[PDB]
């Protein structure tokens, strides 16, 4: 019964403003987010719900609601846009993309 | 509220979590032979008949088996003891000579595995050499490349690292070892067998020393362990984690009999000035290859009980056991040490079949190896000399080591594989009951008492 | 236990008992903390790097009892009133509910402060036991 | 000897003397028991595995004297009556004939028994040390 | 330093102070002398051949204080007159001008005699401690 | 080489019967008997103590 | 050396033991120091030796 889900599918936003991404879950366990520009090696952003990876500003963070998770970002400049992926224990979410207006 | 003055008392019992270097104590008269044993120290002489015990009144304390540092200490202990006891023994380096090998003809037939190899060796005087021969009972000798001759084999120690044979003057054994804390520390022991690895325990009892631990090593299966008294226990860091491991203790032992029917003969070779080399010289009997026997009527029921125990945590998921995962030869096979040799078995039928729990003689073909890397699998490489005559082992299996599969399988199905691990993980199944805490006689507590007044002697105050 | 009797593994049951019983038969820890149970390999050096640490800790505790004016005394009062912020100011009617192990948290933070007051509780005696006035 | 004077090897002659002289100048053993006179090979490890044993034994003896109220006292009376079966009940008439080395046999069996009563004689002071209305 | 609490690297300044200030805050040396800061190679054996020497020195000093009657006492009078030849016989007028480090030379030669005198001043208590009709 | 490899004594070190005195550690006394009629076993009644042999 | 000749060093090649002690092979190393003593007792001006 372990299935993930991410929404919304894609974003087109002006730089310097927030965005909101949701990652659902159906099992007790940790969670982490990954960032991916096209081509390059993806990067870790946050893990264990709300703890934050080394070498990133405080733009990116979220809350562990329990049966669901919400990620929000603040003041996203044009150079930080890419593709987001959710994680659990083996399951990688459907993924979503943010693009610059 | 009341008028109070500070008061000292101490000598009190109060403890906190800590780490230490423990003392070892071997059981019974084993200390007499312990001078010349390895996997036993030099020597854990027992000063008292351990373990004395008391049940603590209304005490509950936290426990943890995975963070437990005693296994981490005993890994270093056993590795250091092993290397230091192997250190003064005779080296075997100058055998690495171009071996010419052929089918090992034997009495009234031909043997199944080994090769009769003959090579040049150094006699007593270094300026001359002779044509000795020995029967290495492994096909694992590598054929040297860079040649169309299909017979110039090489011993595989010299490919990566020199080696040292074990002195027969010192014999390894699974002697029981009891750990006793040094002065100032106490070892707390939990007695609630429902303890599933982490959490409170509310029947804590202190002991001067730990109960009988024995350092026997075996991958994919535990040998001569200790059984959970009531039911079959499952323990893991977190079951839902696909990684990590699942340790299982059985409720009843199942006898395992393993033997080596070939009647080997021990031979000596004079490699150097005082250095004597032992090898299997000739076979003087019939040939059947080594094997193990396990009764099906017990094992088939044991798997079903462990299956329903698994299904308790995995609701309505049918359990499939399946063949070993893969990888090295030390974990695709069942490894267990016995009597001087090292046995490797294919797990012919200790894996197969599905058993839902709700109910909707086995033979193992085993290879043998002389040269081993230690089960930590990096450093030292040995030569284990052959043991004369047929060998017989009788031991009690007590616990299984499993890892989980998945997953995009259809959610009603699940699969488990027998796969071993570190040397630490085998002992951790037996050392899950203990902590180490330092007794701290604390400072100041309030009292009805008042000032002393010129150091006055007085009665009740 | 009452009187003394008992053993280390006959008195350690007080660890969960009410503090009244633990205030009696408080002796065997001192008898236990010193020695207890205890070619070169792992057996050897452990008897030295471990035993000497135990002896060192015991001398530390004995010295700390010596300075305060409590040498050779299992039980020792001092001249320091108990400030209300550190704990219940009426523990005489409350320690009958609490064991030592659970008690220790309630004063773990303020333990380091109180030694600074036992030290002056000693050195006031130091000042008093010397000078001129008391001719004999 | 009288006073102390003497040496370790100036007082050890008392070992065969009457108990009267051995009762005086009883100190130099307490001065001797501490340390006395004391590439790696056999000379090296012996100054540790033997030295620490001597220090351990001395701390054990000091602890045992510390519990019973006889801390820092060469001589120490105590509240335990002497039972008949342990020895002569008139040894004030008899110790003038006996050296200690011969005396030790006559009470070798009962020492462990006597410590049991001596501990009680000590720790009955704990009840008196606290917790009622001695007004001063 | 002055006061009571003191630190080793807060009180050691008294080494050049007038002896009066060194007559207070005298504790931290006793608090430091015990332990202080502390494959086999040069690091290993030093923690044993050095730590045990410090422990032995501390036990030696403690025993020497124990015999004379000054066990567990930072300051300790003793029943011996001060002979004129050893120092100024009015040092209460003079020690306010001298530090300990300079003082030590002035009595370096006569320490061994004074230890022998305190030994007698102690064991004159032994005759008092036993064997007559003090009805108590 | 018939039975066991060997090693030579370095001339840097020398064989010498230097006298050695055994000294007791702390807390022990090495008793000594002075009666030269002592034939190996039995009482000795002129016992003397020493720091070292 | 590449497009020239180096100043400090001499190329050297010698026989060495392979994994099996009964055979040997040729190898070469560049000891970056002139200080390899030419063995005496020979008119061959090339049979050097390591000075350890």
Residue numbers in the entry:
A (entry chain H): 1 to 30, 33 to 91, 96 to 107
B (entry chain E): 1 to 360, 371 to 471
C (entry chain F), D (entry chain J), E (entry chain B): 472 to 509, 527 to 624
F (entry chain I): 158 to 210
G (entry chain A): 106 to 157
What text does the study give?
The HIV-1 Env is a trimer of gp120-gp41 heterodimers that are heavily shielded from the host immune systems by N-linked glycosylation and further protected from neutralization by conformational masking and considerable sequence variability. A glycosylated region near the base of the third variable loop (V3) of HIV-1 Env forms a supersite of vulnerability that is targeted by antibodies originating from diverse germline genes in multiple HIV-1 infected individuals. Here, we determine structures of antibodies in complex with HIV-1 Envelope for all observed members and ancestral states of the broadly neutralizing HIV-1 V3-glycan targeting DH270 antibody clonal B cell lineage. Here we used cryo-EM to visualize the interactions of a complete inferred DH270 clonal tree with the co-evolving virus Env.
